[PDB]
Design a protein around this nucleic acid. Structure first.
Lengths: 98, 136, 49, 181, 44
RNA sequence: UCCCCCGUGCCCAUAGCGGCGUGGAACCACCCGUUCCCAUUCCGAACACGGAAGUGAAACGCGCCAGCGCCGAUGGUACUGGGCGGGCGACCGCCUGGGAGAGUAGGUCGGUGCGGGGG
RNA sequence: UUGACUGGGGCGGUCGCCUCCUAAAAGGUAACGGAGGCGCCCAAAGGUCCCCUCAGGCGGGACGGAAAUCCGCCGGAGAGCGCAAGGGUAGAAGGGGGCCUGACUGCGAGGCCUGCAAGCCGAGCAGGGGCGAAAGCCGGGCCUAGUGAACCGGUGGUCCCGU
RNA sequence: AAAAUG
RNA sequence: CGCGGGGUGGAGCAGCCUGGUAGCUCGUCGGGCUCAUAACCCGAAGGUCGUCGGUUCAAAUCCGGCCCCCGCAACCA
């Protein structure tokens, strides 16, 4: 089993919980200490193309505008099994860096 | 016959554990006063027990020494006693059932235990059964 | 499946009849019968009759 | 060198007889096959400049991958070598590389094994999957006699996606696994 | 061993502590000097 | 509104183990491949990328079961702030407030916010 | 000049520090009361990023004990955590790998403990760095023992003094 | 100028 | 009661604080010399290292528990 929880090591509020399926990637901005979610940007549960990586971006841009819209910026990335690689949000806007 | 030992005297308060119930056997020997019973005593009783009815039934000794009884050599003061020397003992709080017999007549059984009591440094009482259990 | 670690392939695979003369494929000792059989005591008395 | 009979046959020949023989429903509820682990123990890495990364690759040839030098988990004064380092070579053939090796095994090695009568049908004994150990290292088509500088066989394990040794036993009796009933 | 690190071509000390026989000798490593910022600091 | 499912948090075993049928349209997974990214002390097993033919067998989801596990009263005592008698002593007892632990009856194969995709 | 403690003194034992217990559920708490350690060690046994998860038990396996190394289930911790014990811990403090050297310099809010003087924790600011995409973490080590005021000198260094 | 007993 | 020395093949002594190699003399055993015995000569064997366990990869060896063996003290009233 993977006890990953690479997260849990999230203390500076605002979590960009991702989630790669086997076709669609979902990202989600969440507030801890007070369990609730705000910004969201799925893969095909949205629409756009059929190419993972390619999509993985236009799917992140999504969070950008969407988020910035309601006054969001500085945050920390996320997703544990994640393995910072292919899946990506390498995009402007959010000051989550990376 | 084990563990790290030469322990603290400690004391015997109320006999909140002085009062079980015949577990096996048929008749029994329950204690009335609290005390430390030297193994020397147990045997000295048990023996006379069996010995009272040569080639008889079964004897059950629920009490069991494990507490080390220390003692000084006949001098003054300087660290705990040589300890043990004489040996170990078991702690009996008024009510505990020490010995219990079975497989024999009450005339034989009852009279058997009576003797034991003389060996023990306490005051005893003899019991039958039919009492406690967990049935319905 | 990585760097100068592995070794090769080519035909060291489905090269079926790769000269069974190497020693023996599913040739002999098919796990059946070979030389003679048993000796048999008594059941074999050629002394007389 | 991509697809081999054994593999082939397994599909267009074994599956059926099995689907029937036993009687399944979902091709996955079937008796798949997926892992072979030829492992050695050797004996040591003790004195006299004992490199023994020789039979290391000797093993590679007989297979395809490079084995993993195994190390001590404990330390035993009884018979030398303790604490770490030492040796206990191992390798894991999966898919392709696996099929072939077996096919090469079940048609040249075992044959020829010293004498040979079959295999032990008790080695599974029930618990899904098999096992067996070969004494000689030169009982392989790739390796030679003027090559091996010292005997030292080993043991190989094999894994079934099936449970009951019954199944497992059938799957191999079909794949050509001989059996000293 | 009571060691200290002498920034090559100057002063300063770090006051470390090696283990000699236990693989040592030639101790030196990027430390921060007081005379401007870093150098490496040797042994001695 | 009420269903189904993919992410997530909270309560932190009454959600556990083990059984028993079900779910593939969606989702999810397993699968299809190893050219590229990157991979395993040897293995694309795991990480990873590219694809979607086949499957619900694995795994996960959802239900039912009490055999194991977990929970668990009420009563009643043990012990006990405080106060107080009897006896030479060893010890026994009352008044006034608190009050288990075991064991019994019995309970339980979850509960609950947030955001999503589908009828 | 030839110490003190000490159920008289001598003889014997001891003399500082760590950990359980005694200790009576905050701390603290005696006795020549019960029971064990320390006067070191790591240049990786330290930083950070990324991975992995134990011990056992049960089968199955060439040499092969009753654990050498393999494969398969079961096993939430009984292993591990340099050395005593204890507390803590796998949702890692454990096992492995890549880069590193913060085992930094200037400081230090606010506290713990406390007769004194000592001991302990420490966010944050500055400088100039490490690892990570990043959020971030880094002033030695899972933590508590591994230590000694002053005086007198020794080696260096430097803005100072120098009859 | 020479290495015990039965 | 307390200190401290010591238990190793059959006898008598090493080896132990500096853990992995058990050494010496005597005697036991086999073969020679001699008419024969000694002597002398050549060649072998033989040790759970007192015990019950602890630490270690490994204990004759280091740390505790008794069992016999040996010595030294046990003083003022």
């Amino acid at each position: 089993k993977f006890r990953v929880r690479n997260r849990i090591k999230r203390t500076g509020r605002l979590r960009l919980s991702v989630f790669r399926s086997l076709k669609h990637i979902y990202a989600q901005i969440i507030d801890d200490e007070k369990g609730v979610t705000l910004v969201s940007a799925s893969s095909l549960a949205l629409k756009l193309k059929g190419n993972k990586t390619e999509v993985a971006r236009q799917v992140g841009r999504a969070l950008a505008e969407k988020a910035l819209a309601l006054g969001i910026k500085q945050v920390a990335f996320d997703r544990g099994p994640y393995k910072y690689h292919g899946r990506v949000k390498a995009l402007a806007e959010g000051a989550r860096e990376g | 016959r084990m563990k790290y030992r030469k322990q603290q005297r400690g004391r015997l308060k109320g006999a909140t554990k002085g009062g079980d119930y015949v577990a096996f056997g048929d008749y029994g020997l329950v204690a009335l006063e609290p005390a430390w019973i030297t193994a020397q005593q147990i045997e000295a009783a048990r023996v006379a027990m069996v010995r009272h009815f040569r080639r008889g039934g079964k004897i059950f000794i629920r009490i069991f020494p494990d507490k080390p009884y220390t003692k000084k050599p006949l001098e003054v003061r300087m660290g705990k006693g040589k300890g043990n020397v004489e040996g170990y003992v078991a702690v009996v709080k008024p009510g505990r059932v020490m010995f219990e017999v079975a497989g024999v007549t009450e005339e034989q059984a009852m009279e058997a235990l009576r003797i034991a009591g003389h060996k023990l440094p306490i005051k005893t009482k003899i019991v039958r059964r039919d009492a406690y259990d967990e049935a319905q | 499946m990585k760097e100068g670690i592995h070794p090769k392939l080519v035909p060291a695979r489905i090269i079926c009849g790769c000269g069974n003369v190497i020693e023996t494929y599913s040739t002999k000792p098919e796990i059946y019968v070979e030389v003679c059989s048993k000796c048999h005591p008594f059941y074999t008395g050629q002394q007389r009759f | 060198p991509l697809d081999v009979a054994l593999k082939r046959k397994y599909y267009e020949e074994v599956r059926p007889e099995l689907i029937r023989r036993f009687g399944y429903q979902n091709v996955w509820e079937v008796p798949r096959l997926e892992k072979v682990v030829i492992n050695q123990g050797l004996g040591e890495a003790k004195e006299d400049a004992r490199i023994l990364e020789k039979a290391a690759q000797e093993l590679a040839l007989i297979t395809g991958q490079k084995p993993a030098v195994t190390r001590a988990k404990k330390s035993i004064s009884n018979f030398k070598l303790r604490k770490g380092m030492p040796i206990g070579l191992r390798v894991t053939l999966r898919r392709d590389r696996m099929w072939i090796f077996l096919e090469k095994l079940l048609n040249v090695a075992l044959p020829r094994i010293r004498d040979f009568r079959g295999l032990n049908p008790n080695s599974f004994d029930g618990r899904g999957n098999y096992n067996l150990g070969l004494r000689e290292q030169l009982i392989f088509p790739e390796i030679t006699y003027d090559m091996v500088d010292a005997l030292r066989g080993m043991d190989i394990a094999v894994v079934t996606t099936a449970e009951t040794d019954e199944e497992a036993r059938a799957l191999l009796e079909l794949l050509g696994f001989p059996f000293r009933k | 061993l009571l060691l200290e690190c002498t920034e090559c071509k100057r002063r300063n000390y770090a006051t470390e502590k090696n283990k000699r026989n236990t693989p040592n000798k030639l101790e030196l490593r990027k430390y921060c000097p007081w005379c401007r910022k870093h150098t490496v600091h040797r042994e001695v």
